[PDB]
Amino acid sequence: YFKIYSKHTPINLVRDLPQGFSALEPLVDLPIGINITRFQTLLALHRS
Amino acid sequence: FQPTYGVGYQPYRVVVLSFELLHAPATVCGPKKSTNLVKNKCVNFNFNG
Ligand SMILES: *[C@@H]1O[C@H](CO)[C@@H](O)[C@H](O)[C@H]1NC(C)=O
């Protein structure tokens, strides 16, 4: 089972993580059934 | 194939459904039937397992 929990929070702090409490709601459970040992973030470029 | 052929030579469309169970969570489930809801009585309830 792949559990994805997520939370959207409106913050106004410039640099670091804000200090507070926010419990993450369960968003989606995925029937993947696969081995995962490594991950990588995907970003987006800005072209001009 | 021709429409005037015998029944042993006429074209037959065949669909074979293959059902396998693997160690991954099974997601193609049947449509579980739902009994109408009855309130205010001592009943045996089965809600989502
Ligand atoms: C999952 O992958 C890791 C790293 O490749 C491996 O050591 C481990 O034995 C694998 N587990 C299964 C159940 O295949």
Swiss-Prot record, chain B:
Changing Y9H: In strain: Omicron/BA.1, Omicron/BA.2, Omicron/BA.2.12.1, Omicron/BA.2.75, Omicron/BA.4, Omicron/BA.5, Omicron/BQ.1.1, Omicron/XBB.1.5, Omicron/EG.5.1. Residues 23-45 are annotated as: Disordered. It comes from the Viruses. Binds to host ACE2. RBD also interacts with the N-linked glycan on 'Asn-90' of ACE2. Cleavage of S generates a polybasic C-terminal sequence on S1 that binds to host Neuropilin-1 (NRP1) and Neuropilin-2 (NRP2) receptors. Interacts with host integrin alpha-5/beta-1 (ITGA5:ITGB1) and with ACE2 in complex with integrin alpha-5/beta-1 (ITGA5:ITGB1). May interact via cytoplasmic c-terminus with M protein. May interact (via N-terminus) with host bilirubin and biliverdin, thereby preventing antibody binding to the SARS-CoV-2 spike NTD via an allosteric mechanism. Attaches the virion to the cell membrane by interacting with host receptor, initiating the infection. The major receptor is host ACE2. When S2/S2' has been cleaved, binding to the receptor triggers direct fusion at the cell membrane. When S2/S2' has not been cleaved, binding to the receptor results in internalization of the virus by endocytosis using host TFRC and GRM2 and leading to fusion of the virion membrane with the host endosomal membrane. Alternatively, may use NRP1/NRP2 and integrin as entry receptors. This is Spike protein S1. It comes from Severe acute respiratory syndrome coronavirus 2 (2019-nCoV). The chain holds residues 497 to 545 of 1273 of the full protein.
